[PDB]
């Protein structure tokens, strides 16, 4: 065996080659045919299959990944020289294993795991251009043009310092383009923040795609990266050979996995309680228990959590539909709006919290910045591409920001003309905006536009405008206080799993009952407004709400009850916003 | 803080944690370390070399009968209040309020036991001097003017004075002139008792539990009652509501009371001591011992008190509706009143909040509102 | 004193290719091209890649693999070939411009493997930089030994000589440059990116800068699409290196007979059927906007905008517009942006944007400081990106004044002449504009004139060929029918559409129809005159008055409608229908 | 903390040393009837049980066992002789591994060598055979008093105190070589 290891080249190759041919879910030889037909010589492998097939080889694999992988390549190439012995390929088959060790708490990583293959889930934050890394430097004498090359002198390139033909002093200068190069794109990735237990100090690591798997993942992608953990010294000065006793560590990526749920008991349990007739009311009341005397608002945000079913309108040429729900909660200061956003943001997965001010630390926009790599820093909206962005003080925002919010609400994407090029960053978020009335309190008889002073277009894009006020009712003050002092002296986990499963599995589809009910609702609203009348945007909101309400019941189809309650809440939002 | 004498300042010691000992501490942790003190060489009459402490073990740490008789005195807390900056003539009700902040709340279960107090008023009203006495009296404290928040130095997390409070008190003079970014930061502190900072877009969150004692002045000279609150001061009115109490000081020329203060000053000049009060001020160590005893207590709120508490709350909320200007009454106001009452119960060394404690807290709340006159 | 045998051999064979290979006529084309090249302002010899392959296949392969190594030698071969062939000036550069390379890589294909080898690519220019002389062969002079160091080639950076030319002397640090003696070549940097066709959905397009020299310096302009022949090369940057594609020659990206023969027989049959299909007008409108109820005049107006009229140029060097400008003003909702979204989605070369855009370009060309270089660069705007295309601009009432006046110049001239900070340039802009806006206060007061109902300037309104006023009707029938259309659209996730003509079939039909240049029959000339008498006779009161510009829109519509059914001549049927639409497009004041 | 220096821890000459080692210990003489005795191994044990600490060596026997090794000794006697000495040192130790107390400390060996090949005339000599094994006949004419010459030597810097121990002075009539500073 190679020194300091338990690794036999032939036996490991034979065992791996045996695993390729002999497997129980044989799929490896089938995708070998796909690679032979397609010609893409990279054969990615789930390492857990090797664990199931042979844990010792899997253990042996992880211990010495750099050494075992060439054996794996030799196994597959000879298999390709066995299966499809004749073919044409620009390079022979490679392998990109993945999904081996879910020690994904990058905050919990140790020097014990140096040069051991690992996979971790995280969100790529910053990227770069593929670094042209020199690997063989052609050289030419200034005196006699002596042609020579130096090949892979251990990262650095050894200067000749003396010619070979005329043998003069140092005259052989490198020729850049004649030199050989490879691609090494550097990538900076943040540890998956939801996965972290505390999150008090989110972790970031550098990654490198060397000559392969380059540029395939753009910033903001929450993916599982699999590669070899690696550490290197750093010279105290470039000129001197002294180095620090501490090594900065990075990853040489091998595979990117773009990214069942729970066990049978949870799906059984959530399906059991879904059958409760008042699950919609219980879940609404159960949502945010610290709140008191708010049910319409709780139901609306609850429908926003479930959201409408994803709809692919590519065939229609109509563009992407805003399947997500955006609700603006407008109410007096001290009315629990901030607590509602914090509770939802804390509860919700892959969500974000920001404030309308530009002083918000996260920032609701993405823009370039130089280290001096002019690299793009993302935004909370782009970060919450599928999550929920809880925006506080939405009334106090800049017009440039308001234009951005109109765009993403109109498109669920953000267009940024970085440098000169333009990029459309998808943001399919659910926007939980919170605004407060201008002046000390909300002046009655003044419209939301008057008392918040925002464009009619942008506020109209919000499917729901929930108006809440603190009434001047001492009984309400008395009951609220008793509720608080009662609190002075269902768990969120089950509700979170319910919503996640409903997102994952249940995708409500329309019923003609829902179709006719919605059409009846809109024309009734049109007739009421015939004498701020009805608009087809209101129909779209009613469409989305019924999808969410159907998703709440896990019916997997939109029913008339979804339409009826959606119209009820839509009228409640109208009643809350009614002014005439 | 206790180690440093008043005339001195804290001194740092680099410590090298290694192996299993790592990850066992965070900034602001009041830890105790055991290890070897050794030199590191990163030549006059011998070599000069920086020192450090190689870490071995790390641990994150947390009277007489006559004293009890003094505690049993009904004017005990009043005597303690008089002992808070006795040279500062007047403002005794404020001095009581400062005492409540020093003891803080209970944090029963949780509840935000911190008592953030903001002070506004014309320059030259003992405001700055009051904070200094509190910092001296405080067992653990930080003083700042407006760094305040954490940072990622270049590659290390360096905690600001807000973090270094850590359930102490972060006295903040010149509060009105704070950077608006810091205003947002302290908003999070009063909201969640945490500080989120992102130098490299990495929202690192630090447990900044502490009570914030703010001090500001109205712009353009002295306060103008004809000009509304926040008309003379350039702070978000919402942030003012976040404070548990907000006391206003106005330079009303009152020839008699001003003369009384002048008499107080002249005595201090002629004696280097305040005039002999009814109860003499006590040594700060004795005060801190009483505070430490008060932190031992966590008085509860019986549900019978809730009926009267809610009765008082709706009454003052009605007064707010009667007031032409909204007086910031809300559930925030109720919760603060709960903090004050249980804080008073800690001063009483009684594990049940009394109606007396509730009433006095309302009195201070009313006076703070009356200060807005 | 070391000779590259491969480059020397390649040079000789390339010289043999120049002086033996010939056209189908049997005469040496490259002698004639060199004969043309003797004139001033002419130094790049255009050469077909396949020709040198046919002359010597191995020569092409060696040039392909070793383009950087051998290309300087080919320039020497051209210099020797051109110097003796005629009285060429002794001192001016000569270049070999290659083209017709079958290998058209995408930008994503580019790797370190492609450094130094010949290659062709296609993409869209983003921004263009000024021209700059740049030293290529330094002529230095040591301070101490006073030996003029010459032929010290610089690899695109200030590379001084390694040591003194005199071996005895070891100054090594004080090589004074001779500016005049050192060889200089003009380089212009231009940014390019992947075209929309090559760009995957939701993926950031690649960006690359290219160096332009010789006649290729201003071959292209900002915001256009072009194919670039040359090689990828490495340049050091502050052992770091970065990739730039030196495009030796550049061409624009990619007759009715040529398309029809290029078109497959089945595609030919469908297109010929579509042209033969009478009443294609309405049936295509229904197909193009399946998720729409009513507003068929909008669908018809959009389709005519898609076809566009026949552009013409007078003998006085004045351009008569071919395309048109169409605006839609409507109440909140009412599907304007949805109409624009359908147009942008279906149509290639169609770009969607909004009047709220705050980018540096601001929908048009701009002269903006480089973040890194700190010099100004010509950044093209989406109007420039949509040159010979379509711009689906939203919130047209909410545009910027600088953009509005700049857009006014574009529609006025079909070009924009930009000058700022000493930099000066002009760019063609022949783009059909689809404006979407809303009335003032959101709701259209039909009792008020259109000028009163919107904030747009009168010249801008005058220069818009068509207007569509979409008022929020309280009519339940339209509201119910739209609701059924939307609900069936949502409920029937797909197949709700009724596309009598497939989208690709329409697109190829647009291309084949666009090859035509329909003429105006003398019947149509008088009928156009007669219809303009009717409009002048109408004289209203209209929301806007009548001028000669109305006739200009009328003829551009009639040319488009002669292009609709591929007929190469306008008929009175086309003219009256155009008169019907535009006259219907006039909304009289309903006070 | 930089105040202490940890010590670094851990054609082919070692291959040649192995070749001598196997040759000395594993060379067999005699036959099956007389036993295939290990001449050098037994003589070494005899010689180290006694105080001889030398061995005769038959160059022809080395040639028969390994022609290349003898050729190397002819070509470059000095280096290969030294390696042969180290092999002789090693094989002697393992042969006599359980030496009596104190005697376990090991003493070097003079590997004396003989060749049955004929001598060469001293008149037939050239510088080509410098650093080459030579064999000649003759009669001795004079002898010197036996003395002690230093092979392992150590010196101290007189002022700096820098000590340079275990310096090897090559055998022969060579002088000393002091440090520069
Ligand atoms: N209807 C209610 N039910 C329960 N708690 C309430 C209700 N109204 C107010 N509260 C309580 O009042 C306090 C309001 O705090 P919070 O900061 O969340 O208010 P807010 O209205 O969002 O404030 P702002 O708009 O000033 O940011 C919290 O204690 C909240 O629990
Ligand atoms: N009520 C008071 N009783 C006793 N001394 C007072 C009182 N008010 C002010 N002083 C004295 O005023 C002197 C100078 O003013 P002082 O330091 O109190 O200002 P300040 O209120 O901190 O002002 P600012 O916040 O504007 O800097 C102090 O030495 C303090 O002793
Ligand atoms: N006449 C109509 N026929 C069919 N669908 C319609 C019609 N008018 C509106 N709609 C529907 O209205 C829905 C919402 O309209 P949309 O968001 O496209 O409006 P918009 O034109 O962008 O509005 P605005 O720019 O005034 O805010 C669209 O999905 C479209 O299906
Ligand atoms: Mg729109
Ligand atoms: Zn040379
Ligand atoms: Zn010189």
Q: Is A201 on the interface with B (CB under 8 A)?
A: yes
Extract long-range pairs of B59-63: CB within 8 Å, 24+ residues apart. Answer: B59/B31, B59/B32, B59/B33, B60/B24, B60/B25, B60/B29, B60/B30, B60/B31, B61/B30, B61/B31, B61/B32, B62/B30, B63/B289, B63/B293
- Cα gap B211→B192, rounded to integer Å: 12
Helices (H) and strands (E) in chain A, counts: 18, 18
- Give B206's strand partners: B195
Using CA atoms, how far residue C133 sits from A169, C180, C186, C189, D17, in Å, is: 33, 12, 4, 12, 69
Chains that touch D (3 or more CB pairs under 8 A): B
CATH class of B65-365: alpha beta
Residue by residue, DSSP assigns B245-261 as: EEEEE-----HHHHHHH
Task: Count Cβ atoms within 10 A of the Cβ of residue A27 and give its class: 0-12 exposed, 13-18 middle, 19 or more buried.
Answer: exposed
Nearest-atom number in ligand 2 for the CA of B87 is 4
Which chain B residues contact residue D1 at CB under 8 A? 38-41, 52
Q: How far is the CA of A398 from the centre of ligand 1 (A)?
A: 25
Question: Computed over its alpha carbons, how large is the radius of gyration of chain A?
Answer: 30
State the helix-helix crossing angle for C296-307 and C503-515, rounded to 10 degrees.
50
**Backbone torsions φ then ψ of A82, nearest 5 degrees:** -95, -60
- Cα gap A437→A453, rounded to integer Å: 9
Residue A540 assigned to a binding site: yes
Q: Is C297 on the interface with A (CB under 8 A)?
A: no
Q: Is B126 in the pocket of ligand 2 (CB under 6 A)?
A: yes
Using CA atoms, how far residue C399 sits from C337, C406, D77, in Å, is: 15, 11, 97
Ligand nearest to the CA of C338: 3
- Cα gap C35→C52, rounded to integer Å: 19
Within chain C, what is the greatest distance between any pair of CA atoms? 99
- Cα gap A386→A350, rounded to integer Å: 8
**Backbone torsions φ then ψ of C159, nearest 5 degrees:** -100, 110
Ligand nearest to the CA of A145: 5
Q: How far is the CA of C353 from the centre of ligand 4 (A)?
A: 11
* 3-class state of residue A565 by DSSP: helix
Total residue length of chain B? 373
Using CA atoms, how far residue D119 sits from B257, B320, D122, D123, in Å, is: 132, 130, 9, 12
Q: How far is the CA of C542 from the centre of ligand 4 (A)?
A: 27
> Six-digit token pair at C558?
């009639």
Mutate to test the pocket of ligand 2, among B90, B125, B262 (most ligand atoms within 8 A of CB): B125
- Give C115's strand partners: C232
Total residue length of chain D? 181
**B346 closest CA partner among B83, B45, B107, B35:** B107
Angle at C41 (CA atoms; ends C37, C46), nearest 5 degrees: 40
Chains that touch A (3 or more CB pairs under 8 A): B, C
Residue B127 assigned to a binding site: yes
Whether the Cβ atoms of residue C310 and residue C322 lie closer than 8 Å to each other: yes
Q: Do A315 and C494 touch (CB under 8 A)?
A: yes
Report the b/e string of A347-367 with b at 16+ CB within 10 A.
Answer: bbebbbbbbbbeebbbbbbbe
CB atoms within 10 A of CB B212: 24
Chains that touch B (3 or more CB pairs under 8 A): A, D
**A22 closest CA partner among A68, A54, A62, A67:** A54
Positive or negative: CA dihedral A482, A484, A488, A493:
positive
CB atoms within 10 A of CB B36: 9
Whether the Cβ atoms of residue B172 and residue B214 lie closer than 8 Å to each other: yes
CB atoms within 10 A of CB A563: 27
Instruction: Specify binding-site residues of C.
Output: 293, 333-337, 438, 549, 552
Using CA atoms, how far residue A225 sits from A100, A195, C260, D88, in Å, is: 11, 14, 50, 60
Instruction: Give the rounded distance of the alpha carbon of A209 from its chain centre.
Output: 20
Secondary structure letter of residue B14 according to DSSP: -
**Best mutation target, C479, C496, C503, to test chain A (most A CBs within 10 A):** C479
If residue A60 lies in a helix (H) or strand (E), which one and from where to where?
helix A55-63
Nearest-atom number in ligand 2 for the CA of B91 is 1
Q: Do C162 and A403 touch (CB under 8 A)?
A: no
**C180 closest CA partner among C119, C225, C139, C221:** C139
- Cα gap C32→B187, rounded to integer Å: 80
Whether the Cβ atoms of residue C60 and residue C99 lie closer than 8 Å to each other: no
Q: Is A355 in the pocket of ligand 1 (CB under 6 A)?
A: no
Residue by residue, DSSP assigns B42-81 as: --TTS----EEEEEEEEEE----HHHHHHHHSTTHHHHHH
Q: How far is the CA of B355 from the centre of ligand 2 (A)?
A: 36
* 3-class state of residue A150 by DSSP: strand
Instruction: Give the rounded distance of the alpha carbon of B69 from its chain centre.
Output: 28
Q: How far is the CA of B87 from the centre of ligand 2 (A)?
A: 11
- Contact flag for B and D (3+ C-beta pairs < 8 Å): yes
> Six-digit token pair at B362?
């309302």
Which chain D residues contact residue B39 at CB under 8 A? 1, 3
Report the b/e string of A437-447 with b at 16+ CB within 10 A.
Answer: beebebeeeee
- Give A172's strand partners: A141
**C484 closest CA partner among A519, A567, D98:** A519
Secondary structure letter of residue A166 according to DSSP: S
Ligand nearest to the CA of A335: 1
Q: Do C497 and A315 touch (CB under 8 A)?
A: yes
Helix, strand, coil share of chain A (percent; to 5): 35, 20, 40
> Six-digit token pair at C513?
């129809």
If residue A45 lies in a helix (H) or strand (E), which one and from where to where?
strand A42-46
Q: How far apart are the first and last CA of chain A?
A: 87
**Backbone torsions φ then ψ of C470, nearest 5 degrees:** -105, 95
Question: Computed over its alpha carbons, how large is the radius of gyration of chain D?
Answer: 21
Secondary structure letter of residue A94 according to DSSP: E
E strand intervals along A393-498:
413-416, 423-426, 430-435, 464-468
Positive or negative: CA dihedral C518, C521, C524, C529:
positive
**C222 closest CA partner among C376, C405, C422, C46:** C376
Q: How far apart are the first and last CA of chain C?
A: 92
| A375-377/C390-394 β-pairing | unpaired
How many inter-chain contacts (A to C, CB under 8 Å) are there? 203
Q: Do C206 and A374 touch (CB under 8 A)?
A: no
For residue C22, give the CATH number of its domain: 3.30.1640.10
Whether the Cβ atoms of residue C120 and residue C100 lie closer than 8 Å to each other: no
> Six-digit token pair at A369?
């910045």
**A182 closest CA partner among C388, B309, C243, C477:** C243
Torsion of CA A390, A392, A394, A398, to 10 degrees: -100
Ligand nearest to the CA of A534: 3
**HSE, side-chain direction, 13 A CA sphere, residue A96:** 17
Q: Is C346 on the interface with A (CB under 8 A)?
A: yes
How was this one solved? cryo-EM
E strand intervals along C117-240:
118-142, 148-153, 175-177, 183-193, 207-212, 225-236
Which chain B residues contact residue D2 at CB under 8 A? 40-41
Which chain C residues contact residue A169 at CB under 8 A? 163, 167
Q: Is B39 on the interface with D (CB under 8 A)?
A: yes
Instruction: Give the rounded distance of the alpha carbon of B36 from its chain centre.
Output: 37
**C190 closest CA partner among C217, C163, C165:** C217
Which chain B residues contact residue D3 at CB under 8 A? 39, 41
Whether the Cβ atoms of residue B186 and residue B212 lie closer than 8 Å to each other: yes
A185 Cβ neighbours under 8 A, 6+ residues apart: A127, A128, A129, A130, A131, A208, A209, A214, A215
- Cα gap B146→B162, rounded to integer Å: 11
Tell me which residues have their CB within 5 A of the ion that is ligand 6: C 142, 144-145, 164, 169, 171
- Cα gap C535→C546, rounded to integer Å: 8
**Domain residue spans of chain B:** 65-365
Positive or negative: CA dihedral B254, B256, B257, B261:
positive
Option in A178, A311, A515 nearest C493 (CB): A311
Please name the residue whose Cα sits nearest to atom 1 of ligand 3: C293
Q: How far is the CA of A158 from the centre of ligand 5 (A)?
A: 17
Torsion of CA C349, C353, C358, C362, to 10 degrees: 40
Q: Is A202 on the interface with B (CB under 8 A)?
A: yes
**D41 closest CA partner among D88, D8, D111:** D88
Q: How far is the CA of A239 from the centre of ligand 6 (A)?
A: 26
Please name the residue whose Cα sits nearest to atom 12 of ligand 1: B331
CB atoms within 10 A of CB C496: 19
Mutate to test the pocket of ligand 2, among B120, B121, B129 (most ligand atoms within 8 A of CB): B129
> Six-digit token pair at C182?
């050192």
Option in C108, C346, C356 nearest A406 (CB): C356
Three-state SS sequence of C32-88: HHHHHHCCCCCCEEEEEHHHHHHHCHHHHHHHHHCHHHHHHHHHHHHHHHHHHHCCC
Angle at C118 (CA atoms; ends C114, C120), nearest 5 degrees: 90
């Amino acid at each position: 065996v190679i020194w300091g290891t338990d690794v036999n080249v032939a036996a490991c190759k034979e065992n791996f080659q045996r695993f390729l041919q002999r497997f129980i879910d044989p799929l490896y030889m089938q995708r070998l045919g796909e690679i032979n037909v397609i010609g893409e010589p990279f054969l990615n492998v789930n390492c857990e299959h090797i664990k199931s097939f042979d844990k010792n080889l899997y253990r042996q694999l992880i211990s010495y990944p750099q050494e075992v992988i060439p054996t794996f390549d030799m196994a597959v190439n000879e298999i390709f020289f066995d299966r499809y012995p004749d073919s044409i390929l620009e390079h022979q088959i490679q392998v990109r294993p993945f999904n081996a060790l879910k020690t994904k708490n990058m905050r919990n990583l140790n020097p014990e795991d140096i040069d051991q293959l690992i996979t971790i889930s995280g969100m790529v934050i910053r990227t770069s251009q593929l670094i042209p890394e020199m690997q063989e430097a052609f050289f030419q004498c200034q005196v006699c043009a002596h042609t020579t090359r130096v090949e892979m002198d251990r990262g650095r390139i050894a200067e000749p310092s003396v010619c070979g033909r005329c043998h003069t002093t140092h005259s052989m200068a490198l020729i850049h383009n004649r030199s050989l190069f490879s691609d090494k794109q550097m990538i900076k990735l943040q540890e998956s923040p939801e996965d972290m237990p505390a999150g008090q100090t989110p972790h970031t690591v550098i990654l490198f795609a060397h000559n392969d798997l380059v540029d395939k993942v753009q910033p903001g992608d929450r993916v599982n990266v699999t590669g070899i953990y690696r550490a290197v010294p750093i010279r105290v000065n470039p000129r001197v050979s002294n180095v620090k006793s501490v090594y900065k560590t990075h990853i040489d990526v091998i595979h990117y996995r773009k990214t069942k749920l729970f066990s049978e008991k949870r799906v059984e349990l959530l399906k059991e309680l879904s059958r409760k007739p008042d699950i919609y009311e219980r879940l609404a009341s159960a949502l945010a228990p610290s709140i008191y005397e708010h049910e319409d608002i709780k139901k609306g945000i609850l429908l926003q959590l479930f959201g409408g079913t994803r709809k692919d309108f590519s065939h229609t040429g109509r563009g992407k539909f805003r399947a997500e729900i955006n609700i603006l909660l407008c109410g007096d200061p001290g009315t629990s709006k901030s607590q509602l956003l914090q509770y939802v943001y804390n509860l919700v997965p892959r969500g974000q919290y920001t404030s309308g001010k530009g002083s918000s630390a996260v920032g609701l926009t993405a823009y370039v910045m130089k280290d001096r790599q002019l690299v793009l820093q993302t935004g909370a909206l782009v970060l919450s591409d599928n999550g929920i962005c809880c925006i506080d003080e939405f009334d106090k925002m800049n017009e440039s920001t308001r234009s951005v919010l109109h765009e993403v609400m109109e498109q669920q994407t953000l267009s940024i003309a970085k440098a000169g090029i333009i990029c459309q960053l998808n943001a399919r978020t659910s926007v939980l905006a919170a605004a407060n009335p201008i002046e000390s309190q909300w002046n009655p008889k003044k419209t939301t536009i008057e008392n918040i002073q925002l464009p009619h277009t942008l506020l109209s894009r919000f499917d729901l405008i929930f108006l809440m006020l603190d009434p001047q009712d001492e009984a309400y003050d008395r009951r609220l206080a008793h509720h608080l002092v009662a609190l002075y002296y269902l768990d969120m986990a089950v509700l979170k799993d319910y919503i996640a499963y409903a997102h994952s599995t249940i995708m409500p589809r329309l019923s003609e009952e829902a179709s006719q009910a919605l059409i009846e609702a809109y024309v009734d609203m049109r007739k009421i407004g015939s004498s701020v009348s009805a608009y087809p945007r209101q129909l779209e909101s009613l469409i989305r709400l019924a999808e969410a309400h159907a998703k709440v019941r896990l019916s997997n189809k939109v029913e008339a009850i979804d339409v009826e309650e959606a119209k009820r809440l839509h009228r409640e939002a109208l009643k809350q916003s009614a002014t005439d | 803080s206790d180690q440093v004498p008043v005339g001195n300042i804290p001194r740092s010691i680099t410590v090298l944690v290694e192996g299993e000992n790592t990850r066992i501490a965070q900034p602001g942790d009041h830890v105790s370390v055991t290890g070897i003190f050794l030199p590191i060489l990163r030549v006059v009459q011998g070599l000069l070399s920086e020192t450090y402490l190689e870490a071995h073990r790390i641990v994150k740490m947390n009277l007489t009968r006559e004293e009890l008789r003094q505690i049993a005195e009904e004017d005990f807390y009043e005597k303690l209040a008089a002992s808070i900056a006795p040279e500062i003539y007047g403002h005794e009700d404020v001095k009581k309020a400062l005492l409540l902040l020093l003891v803080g709340g209970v944090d029963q279960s949780k509840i935000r036991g911190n008592i953030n107090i903001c002070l506004m008023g014309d320059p030259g009203v003992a405001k700055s001097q009051l904070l200094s006495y509190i910092d001296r009296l405080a067992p653990r404290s930080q003083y700042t003017t407006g760094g305040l928040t954490a940072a990622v130095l270049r590659l290390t997390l360096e905690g600001g004075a807000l973090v270094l409070a850590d359930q102490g008190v972060c006295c903040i003079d010149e509060f009105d002139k704070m950077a608006e970014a810091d205003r947002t930061a302290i908003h999070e502190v009063m909201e969640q008792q945490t500080i989120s900072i992102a130098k490299a877009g990495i929202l690192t969150t630090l447990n900044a539990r502490c009570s914030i004692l703010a001090a500001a002045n109205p712009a353009y000279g002295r306060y103008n009652p004809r000009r509304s609150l926040e008309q003379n001061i350039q702070l978000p009115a919402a942030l003012l509501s976040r404070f548990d109490l907000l006391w206003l000081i106005q330079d009303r020329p009152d020839r008699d009371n001003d003369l009384r203060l002048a008499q107080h000053i002249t005595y201090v000049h002629q004696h280097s001591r305040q005039p002999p009060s009814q109860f003499e001020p006590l040594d700060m160590k004795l005060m801190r011992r009483y505070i430490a005893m008060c932190r031992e207590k966590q008085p509860m709120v019986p549900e019978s008190l809730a009926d009267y508490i809610t009765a008082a709350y709706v009454e003052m909320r009605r007064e707010a509706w009667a007031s032409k200007d909204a007086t910031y009454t809300s559930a925030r106001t109720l919760l603060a009143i709960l903090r004050l009452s249980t804080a008073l119960a800690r001063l009483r060394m009684v594990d049940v909040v009394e109606k007396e404690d509730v009433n006095e807290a309302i009195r201070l709340m009313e006076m703070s509102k009356d200060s807005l006159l | 004193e070391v000779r590259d045998e491969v480059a020397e051999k390649c040079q000789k064979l390339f010289l043999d290719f120049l002086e033996e290979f010939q056209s189908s006529d049997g005469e040496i084309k490259y002698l004639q091209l060199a004969e043309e090249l003797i004139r001033p302002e002419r130094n790049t010899l255009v050469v077909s890649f396949v020709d040198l392959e046919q002359f010597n296949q191995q020569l092409s392969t060696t040039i392909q693999e070793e383009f950087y190594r051998v290309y300087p030698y080919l320039c020497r071969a051209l210099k020797t070939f051109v110097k003796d062939r005629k009285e060429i000036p002794l001192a001016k550069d000569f270049y070999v411009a290659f083209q017709d390379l079958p290998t058209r890589h995408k930008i994503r294909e580019l790797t370190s493997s492609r450094i130094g080898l010949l290659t062709r690519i296609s993409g869209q220019v983003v921004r263009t930089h000024p021209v700059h002389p740049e030293l290529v062969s330094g002529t230095f002079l040591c301070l101490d030994c006073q030996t003029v160091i010459r032929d010290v080639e610089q690899q695109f950076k200030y590379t001084q000589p390694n040591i003194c030319r005199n071996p005895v002397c070891a100054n090594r640090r004080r090589f004074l440059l001779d500016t005049n003696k050192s060889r200089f070549v003009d380089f212009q940097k231009v940014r390019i990116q992947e075209t929309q066709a090559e760009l995957p959905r939701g993926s950031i397009p690649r960006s690359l800068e290219v160096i332009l020299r010789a006649e290729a310096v201003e071959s292209a302009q900002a915001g256009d699409k072009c194919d670039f022949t040359g090689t990828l090369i490495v340049v050091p940057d502050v052992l770091s290196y970065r990739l730039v594609f030196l495009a030796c020659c550049v061409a624009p990206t990619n007759t009715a007979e040529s398309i029809k023969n290029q078109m497959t027989v089945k595609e030919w049959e469908k297109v010929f059927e579509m042209s033969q299909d009478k009443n294609l007008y309405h049936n295509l409108c229904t197909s193009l906007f399946p998720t729409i109820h009513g507003n068929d005049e909008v669908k018809r107006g959009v389709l005519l905008m898609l076809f566009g009229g026949v552009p013409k140029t007078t003998g006085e060097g004045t351009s008569l517009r071919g395309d048109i400008n169409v605006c839609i003003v409507g109440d909140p909702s009412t599907a304007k942006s949805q109409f624009l979204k359908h147009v942008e989605e279906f149509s290639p070369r169609a770009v969607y944007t909004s009047g709220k855009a705050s980018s540096a370009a601001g929908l048009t060309a701009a002269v903006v400081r480089d973040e890194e270089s700190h010099e100004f660069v010509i950044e093209a705007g989406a109007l420039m990106l949509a040159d010979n295309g379509v711009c689906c601009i939203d919130e047209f009432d909410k545009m910027d004044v600088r953009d509005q006046v700049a857009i006014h110049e574009a529609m006025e001239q079909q070009t924009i002449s930009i000058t700022k900070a000493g930099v000066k340039a002009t760019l063609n802009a022949r783009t059909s504009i689809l404006a979407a806006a809303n009335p003032i206060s959101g709701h259209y007061d039909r009792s008020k004139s259109l000028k009163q109902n919107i904030n747009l300037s009168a010249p801008i309104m005058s220069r818009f060929d068509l207007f569509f006023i979409l008022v929020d009707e309280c009519n339940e029938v339209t509201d119910y029918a739209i609701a059924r259309r939307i609900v069936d659209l949502h409920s029937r996730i797909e197949e709700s559409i009724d596309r009598v003509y497939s989208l690709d079939d329409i697109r190829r039909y647009l291309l084949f129809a666009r090859q035509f240049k329909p003429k105006i029959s003398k019947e149509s000339e008088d009928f156009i005159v007669e219809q303009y008498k009717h409009l002048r006779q109408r004289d209203g009161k209209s929301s806007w008055r009548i001028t000669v510009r109305q006739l200009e829109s009328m003829i551009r519509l009639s040319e488009a409608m002669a292009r609709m059914h591929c007929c190469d001549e306008v008929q009175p049927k086309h003219v009256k229908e155009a008169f019907r639409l535009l006259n219907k497009s006039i909304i009289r004041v309903e006070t | 903390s930089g105040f202490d220096d940890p010590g670094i821890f851990y054609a082919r000459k070692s291959q040649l040393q192995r070749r001598f080692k196997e040759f000395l210990r594993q060379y067999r003489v005699g036959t099956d009837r007389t036993g295939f005795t290990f001449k050098y191994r037994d003589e070494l044990k005899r010689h180290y049980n006694l105080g001889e600490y030398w061995i005769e060596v038959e160059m022809e026997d080395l040639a028969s066992f390994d022609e290349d090794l003898a050729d190397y000794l002819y070509k470059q006697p000095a280096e290969h002789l030294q390696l042969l000495e180290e092999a002789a040192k090693e094989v002697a130790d393992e042969v006599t591994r359980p030496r009596p107390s104190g005697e376990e400390v090991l003493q070097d060996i003079q590997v004396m060598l003989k060749s049955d090949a004929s001598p060469s005339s001293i008149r037939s000599l050239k510088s080509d055979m410098m650093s080459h094994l030579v064999k000649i006949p003759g009669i001795i004419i004079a002898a010197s008093a036996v003395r002690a010459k230093a092979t392992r030597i150590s010196i101290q810097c007189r002022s700096c105190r820098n000590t340079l121990t275990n310096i090897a002075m090559r055998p022969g009539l060579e002088g000393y070589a002091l440090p520069r500073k």
